[PDB]
Design a protein around this nucleic acid. Structure first.
Ligand SMILES: [Mg+2]
Ligand SMILES: [Mg+2]
Ligand SMILES: [Mg+2]
Ligand SMILES: [Mg+2]
Ligand SMILES: [Mg+2]
Ligand SMILES: [Mg+2]
Ligand SMILES: [Mg+2]
Ligand SMILES: [Mg+2]
Ligand SMILES: [Mg+2]
Ligand SMILES: [Mg+2]
Ligand SMILES: [Mg+2]
Ligand SMILES: [Mg+2]
Ligand SMILES: [Mg+2]
Ligand SMILES: [Mg+2]
Ligand SMILES: [Mg+2]
Ligand SMILES: [Mg+2]
Ligand SMILES: [Mg+2]
Ligand SMILES: [Mg+2]
Ligand SMILES: [Mg+2]
Ligand SMILES: [Mg+2]
Ligand SMILES: [Mg+2]
Ligand SMILES: [Mg+2]
Ligand SMILES: [Mg+2]
Ligand SMILES: [Mg+2]
Ligand SMILES: [Mg+2]
Ligand SMILES: [Mg+2]
Ligand SMILES: [Mg+2]
Ligand SMILES: [Mg+2]
Ligand SMILES: [Mg+2]
Ligand SMILES: [Mg+2]
Ligand SMILES: [Mg+2]
Ligand SMILES: [Mg+2]
Ligand SMILES: [Mg+2]
Ligand SMILES: [Mg+2]
Ligand SMILES: [Mg+2]
Ligand SMILES: [Mg+2]
Ligand SMILES: [Mg+2]
Ligand SMILES: [Mg+2]
Ligand SMILES: [Mg+2]
Ligand SMILES: [Mg+2]
Ligand SMILES: [Mg+2]
Ligand SMILES: [Mg+2]
Ligand SMILES: [Mg+2]
Ligand SMILES: [Mg+2]
Ligand SMILES: [Mg+2]
Ligand SMILES: [Mg+2]
Ligand SMILES: [Mg+2]
Ligand SMILES: [Mg+2]
Ligand SMILES: [Mg+2]
Ligand SMILES: [Mg+2]
Ligand SMILES: [Mg+2]
Ligand SMILES: [Mg+2]
Ligand SMILES: [Mg+2]
Ligand SMILES: [Mg+2]
Ligand SMILES: [Mg+2]
Ligand SMILES: [Mg+2]
Ligand SMILES: [Mg+2]
Ligand SMILES: [Mg+2]
Ligand SMILES: [Mg+2]
Ligand SMILES: [Mg+2]
Ligand SMILES: [Mg+2]
Ligand SMILES: [Mg+2]
Ligand SMILES: [Mg+2]
Lengths: 127, 51, 172, 159, 185, 58, 222
RNA sequence: AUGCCCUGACGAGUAGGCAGGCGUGGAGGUCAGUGACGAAGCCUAGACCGUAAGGUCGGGUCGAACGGCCUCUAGUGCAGA
RNA sequence: UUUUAGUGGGCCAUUUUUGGUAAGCAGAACUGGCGAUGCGGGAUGAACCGAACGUAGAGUUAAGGUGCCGGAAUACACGCU
């Protein structure tokens, strides 16, 4: 298990979708701020979407922590994985997406031997 | 780290004001007045009850 | 203002060098509190004398209670009021057990029958009418007849439930 | 069209103040002005030379220069969002001394005098002015002064 | 809501660090930050603030200005501290015995100071031999002697040097600059 | 087309954004417009005083 | 030889000396308050028995509360509210009564409720909402030593020394009152009374002089 | 030690300014980085991190290249014309 | 102290005003506002009342309300219609 952290409070779990991304396919869901002179979203009329602002930011004790309680670390190989040896209560190894399956077996074996929690121990496994 | 109100919290009311113990022991907040019997003048009562 | 109180207010007009010991003017004021009473005191002294609150002082304010609060009394009230088009002097009779009760009834009555506000009304005089047949108004005179008794027909009983099971009655 | 001459809107400012027309009395010409004295500006309408502009009526300034018949006056004038120093060349009939600088100088002399009698004995004499204070407790007698007043008055027209 | 009198979130308007990425100047700032916090000498605070300053806010101090400051009464044996460059001066022929602590010395300035028997010192050696700024004399070069300051506040009746590329007759000596052609200024 | 000729509206609020400045007086003002004969004699009265305080201390 | 056992004990002895002084100061202040109020009651009684009228000394302290918010204030009342440090609604400040400040209180009259505070309200205000101004930074009181560290030059040693200097307007009222941060009061817990606040109290609203009813108001807001 | 910690106050915003960041093509350096045991791309009301720009992972499809960090550079970010 | 952006069409309200029979008309003065600004109330509304806004929680309020739509007394009281 990880360190004793306080209960993680996210303040806004919901994705900040762009205005009218539901309405037009050409308007992607990626957040864009309205720069319109008569934009009800920009003028913050009641009943409209929330805008991302700094008050929603996470408490710095729990920020970047997963629900497990570990900061994630992207790992390509055994040498990258062993830079987390003394940090197994603060860090969990993410295996990179482009690692081949036979190297994933080696990384998972080393991380089980070292006690490193792995967030994705199931990619590219013949299961 | 945390402001404790005096007039609640008797411990903070004794940290401030060491006379808060003596005030309570002599009770000093419900003490009897001297019982004098001074009477107002007839000119006062006449003016008070005047039309 | 549901409980008016009556106050004697004595004010002075502050002693200068030419006049030590000035003349000590006194008023009876109906007000909710002593602040309104002193305010009304300076309001009426700036109408009678050449004085104002900056050049005068209050030397006394006392609440006058009713001498017999549980004796029924007939009062004549002389009142000056502003209408929407002028100023009128008015005499009314009010039957209560107290002067401030009579004055509260007067203010409610003046607001009801004349749409006169508190700011438009001067109480010129409240006097207990000492003898019967000095009572001028016949809405007061009907309550001074001998062995007076009346019923209250159509008694409406207050219900605390929404639904009633009985089809109620207004007997009395 | 419009009109913005030197003496525009000066119909009443440079008028000569009922039953005080004619010649200027001579103490006006025998007052002595030193550099640094604080003077008031009020233009005499009967002398047209050395005459201040209408802006400077009622303005109070400092003598910086003394000449044959005239003194120069520093006046602060609010031009936009700042103050500019203006130098004026005014004859002495448009000039009088400020009585405020009299009153403050006798207060300076009084302060020095009471500080001397505090140095003689009794230090901390408390020699600043104070604003008007709330009055203390009185006892008001009712001796030939029984409080007797009537009520508000009925309305009568008296026309 | 609040009726704010001052502007909210207002930075001080003062450098609290040098804008340069000089590692050695950061080491000097670390040392003098420590001294200015733990010593309560006003010299150390003044030197830290002067270490933050920009290039035109640290003009060079000439050795003739150093020698003139050393000709003050009681200031002959003081350590002259220049937070900035010390330049040479060929217009002075006598140079006194001195200890000068500076950031930089030019080659001529270093040669003149050590040829007069004196010593050229850095700010860390100044901090070691004078941790409280004992027996020091801070010297600053002339700020408004710069060429840019000539053109500052250009306007009528200012006498403040128009921004001009070529200078002579035919370059702004006519209408607006003499009574004969129009008006003067 | 016809428009708004003139108004002094908002001008005092703009002047109080930086809050109308007094002109920062100094000891020793300039001799601008001070009488030239007084200035000429003031030059020599200060020359002689510089020499008098030079000889007083040396 | 760090001398913890004797440094702590010498500091404790100094603490007990300071607490003895604070105890005798507060006993003296309690006797002073009691004899002042009983002498005013007996002066009223003796004047009535002599047929005179005892006129009380006019009040020297008011407590002012800003009761109107931030928007749409004319500039001269806005300046005077900043000068009395009433920069937000339900801010409170003790004010020494002079002519020079009774004409400030006439300018800000439609925006504030004021009146004459009693010892009970000054005591409860300073114990519950009392904050100092110390490099400025709004420090809660909660200790007599931090009061003494800024007001000990004026002979103000404790929180009741501060309360006494406020209520009896002493020579260092200006320093004791500017040291207190403006009181950040709540809304009144029972309400304002008065269905409409922004009339005069004489006319059935809230603003102006409500001479001794300010005690009830501020106790509801505190 | 543009680190860590303590204390206090504050937070509206068009036009506009300034800051700190996110992303794209290419360049120098590095991770002796990833990869036909599957690079890139693409799809995915599956997951994780970031206030957000975005980043990461899982599954499908695919078949040859492509990433992180430190810097450099610009033909570098689209809903409208 | 230097440097530089945008702006140089304004409009509404109280009070003082000019022209006009007048105007949601035209033109000034002082302040506050809208523009540039959401929130609670005025059913609705650029400007009115109240109050100006980081993200939350609890409490108390303003203005406005409390038959029902609608949260809150078909309250209490004196009359008038
Ligand atoms: Mg999120
Ligand atoms: Mg988002
Ligand atoms: Mg598109
Ligand atoms: Mg988008
Ligand atoms: Mg925009
Ligand atoms: Mg819109
Ligand atoms: Mg729109
Ligand atoms: Mg009144
Ligand atoms: Mg009627
Ligand atoms: Mg019946
Ligand atoms: Mg004219
Ligand atoms: Mg004329
Ligand atoms: Mg005149
Ligand atoms: Mg002539
Ligand atoms: Mg600098
Ligand atoms: Mg040059
Ligand atoms: Mg230049
Ligand atoms: Mg050339
Ligand atoms: Mg030439
Ligand atoms: Mg030419
Ligand atoms: Mg045309
Ligand atoms: Mg125009
Ligand atoms: Mg105007
Ligand atoms: Mg402005
Ligand atoms: Mg301006
Ligand atoms: Mg104050
Ligand atoms: Mg002060
Ligand atoms: Mg407050
Ligand atoms: Mg309640
Ligand atoms: Mg209300
Ligand atoms: Mg109101
Ligand atoms: Mg209101
Ligand atoms: Mg705030
Ligand atoms: Mg903001
Ligand atoms: Mg950022
Ligand atoms: Mg390219
Ligand atoms: Mg690239
Ligand atoms: Mg290359
Ligand atoms: Mg294969
Ligand atoms: Mg692939
Ligand atoms: Mg593809
Ligand atoms: Mg989809
Ligand atoms: Mg799949
Ligand atoms: Mg193929
Ligand atoms: Mg191929
Ligand atoms: Mg790859
Ligand atoms: Mg391109
Ligand atoms: Mg392009
Ligand atoms: Mg776009
Ligand atoms: Mg666009
Ligand atoms: Mg298109
Ligand atoms: Mg700019
Ligand atoms: Mg235009
Ligand atoms: Mg119009
Ligand atoms: Mg708009
Ligand atoms: Mg616009
Ligand atoms: Mg608004
Ligand atoms: Mg409302
Ligand atoms: Mg509404
Ligand atoms: Mg309506
Ligand atoms: Mg209003
Ligand atoms: Mg708000
Ligand atoms: Mg309901």
């Amino acid at each position: 298990a990880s360190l004793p952290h306080p209960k993680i409070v996210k303040k806004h779990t919901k994705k900040f979708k762009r205005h009218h991304s539901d309405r037009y396919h050409r308007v992607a869901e990626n957040w864009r701020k309205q720069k319109g002179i008569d934009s009800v979203v920009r003028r913050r009329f009641r009943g409209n979407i929330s805008q991302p602002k700094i008050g929603y930011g996470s408490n710095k004790k729990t920020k970047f922590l997963s629900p497990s309680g570990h900061k994630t670390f992207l790992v390509a190989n055994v040498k990258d994985l062993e830079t987390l040896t003394m940090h197994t209560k603060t860090y969990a190894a993410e295996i990179a997406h482009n690692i081949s399956a036979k190297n994933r077996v080696v990384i998972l074996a080393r991380a089980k031997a070292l006690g490193i929690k792995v967030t994705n121990p199931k990619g590219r496994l013949a299961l | 780290v945390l402001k404790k109100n005096p007039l609640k919290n008797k411990q903070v009311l004794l940290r401030l004001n060491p006379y808060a113990k003596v005030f309570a022991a002599e009770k000093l907040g419900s003490k009897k007045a001297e019982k004098t019997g001074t009477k107002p003048a007839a000119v006062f009562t006449e003016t008070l009850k005047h039309d | 203002m549901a409980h008016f109180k009556e106050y004697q207010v004595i004010g002075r007009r502050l002693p200068t060098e030419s006049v030590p010991e000035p003349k000590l003017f006194r008023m009876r004021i109906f007000a909710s509190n002593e602040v309104i009473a002193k305010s009304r005191y300076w309001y009426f002294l700036q109408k009678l004398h050449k004085v104002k609150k900056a050049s005068g002082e209050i030397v006394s304010i006392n609440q006058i209670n009713e001498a017999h609060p549980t004796k029924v009394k007939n009062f004549g009230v002389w009142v000056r009021y502003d209408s929407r088009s002028g100023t009128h002097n008015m005499y009314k009779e009010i039957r209560d057990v107290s002067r401030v009760a009579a004055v509260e009834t007067l203010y409610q009555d003046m607001a009801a029958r004349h749409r006169a506000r508190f700011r438009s009304i001067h109480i010129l005089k409240v006097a207990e009418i000492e003898k019967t047949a000095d009572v001028k108004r016949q809405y007061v005179k009907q309550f001074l007849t001998k062995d007076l008794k009346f019923p209250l027909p159509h008694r409406v009983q207050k219900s605390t439930k929404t639904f009633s099971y009985k089809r109620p009655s207004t007997f009395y | 069209g419009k009109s913005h001459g030197y003496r525009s809107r000066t119909r009443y400012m440079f008028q000569r103040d009922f039953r005080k027309h004619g010649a200027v009395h001579l103490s006006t010409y025998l007052k002595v002005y030193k550099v640094g004295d604080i003077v008031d500006i009020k233009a005499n309408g009967s002398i047209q030379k050395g005459m201040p502009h209408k802006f400077y009526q009622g303005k109070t300034g400092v003598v910086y220069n003394v000449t044959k018949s005239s003194v120069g006056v520093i006046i602060n004038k609010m031009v936009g969002n700042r103050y500019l120093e203006k130098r004026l060349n005014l004859r002495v009939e448009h000039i009088k001394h400020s009585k405020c600088r009299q009153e403050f100088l006798e207060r300076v002399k009084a302060n020095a005098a009471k500080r001397a009698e505090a140095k003689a004995q009794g230090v901390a004499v408390q020699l600043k002015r104070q604003p008007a204070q709330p009055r203390e407790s009185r006892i008001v007698s009712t001796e030939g002064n029984v409080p007797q007043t009537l009520a508000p008055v009925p309305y009568e027209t008296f026309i | 809501g609040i009726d704010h009198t001052s502007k909210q979130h207002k930075r001080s308007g003062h450098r609290t660090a040098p804008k340069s990425d000089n590692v050695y100047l950061k080491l000097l700032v670390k040392l003098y930050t420590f001294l200015a916090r733990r010593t309560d000498a006003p010299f150390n605070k003044v030197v830290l603030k002067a270490l933050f300053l920009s290039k035109i806010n640290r003009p060079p101090v000439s050795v003739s200005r150093i020698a003139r400051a050393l000709k003050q009464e009681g200031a002959a044996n003081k350590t002259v501290v220049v937070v900035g460059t010390v330049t040479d001066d060929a217009r002075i022929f006598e140079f006194p015995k001195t200890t000068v602590a500076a950031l930089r010395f030019t080659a001529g300035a270093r040669a003149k100071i050590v040829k007069a028997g004196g010593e050229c010192i850095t700010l860390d050696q100044l901090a070691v031999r004078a941790p409280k700024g004992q027996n020091t004399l801070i010297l600053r070069g002339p700020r408004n002697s710069r060429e840019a300051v000539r053109h500052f506040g250009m306007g009528p009746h200012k006498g403040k040097a128009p921004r001009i590329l070529s200078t002579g007759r035919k370059f702004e000596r006519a209408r607006g600059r003499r009574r004969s052609k129009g008006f003067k200024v | 087309a016809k428009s708004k000729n003139h108004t002094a509206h908002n001008q005092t609020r703009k002047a109080h954004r930086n809050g109308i400045k007094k002109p920062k007086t100094y000891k020793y003002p300039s001799l601008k417009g001070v009488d030239p004969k007084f200035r000429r004699n003031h030059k020599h009265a200060l020359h002689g005083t510089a020499k008098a305080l030079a000889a007083a201390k040396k | 030889a760090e001398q913890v056992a004797a440094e702590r004990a010498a500091r404790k002895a100094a603490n007990k000396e300071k607490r003895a002084i604070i105890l005798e100061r507060n006993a003296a202040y309690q006797k002073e308050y009691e004899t002042a109020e009983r002498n005013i009651i007996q002066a009223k009684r003796d004047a009535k028995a002599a047929g005179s009228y005892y006129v009380e000394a006019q009040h020297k302290l008011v407590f002012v509360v800003r009761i109107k918010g931030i928007n749409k204030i004319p500039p001269k009342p806005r300046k005077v509210l900043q000068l009395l440090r009433l920069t937000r609604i339900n801010s409170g400040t003790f004010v020494k009564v002079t002519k020079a400040t009774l004409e400030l209180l006439k300018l800000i009259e439609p925006y504030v409720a004021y009146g004459y505070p009693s010892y009970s309200t000054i005591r409860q205000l300073v114990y519950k909402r009392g904050f100092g101004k110390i490099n400025k930074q709004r420090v809660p009181l909660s200790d007599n030593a931090i009061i003494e560290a800024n007001l000990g030059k004026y002979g103000i040693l404790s929180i009741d020394d501060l309360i006494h200097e406020i209520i009896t307007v002493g020579p260092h009222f200006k320093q004791a009152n500017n040291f207190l941060w403006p009181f950040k009061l709540s809304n009144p817990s029972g309400g304002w009374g008065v269905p409409r606040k922004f009339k005069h109290f004489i006319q059935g609203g809230s603003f102006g002089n409500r001479e001794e009813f300010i005690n009830k108001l501020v106790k509801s807001m505190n």
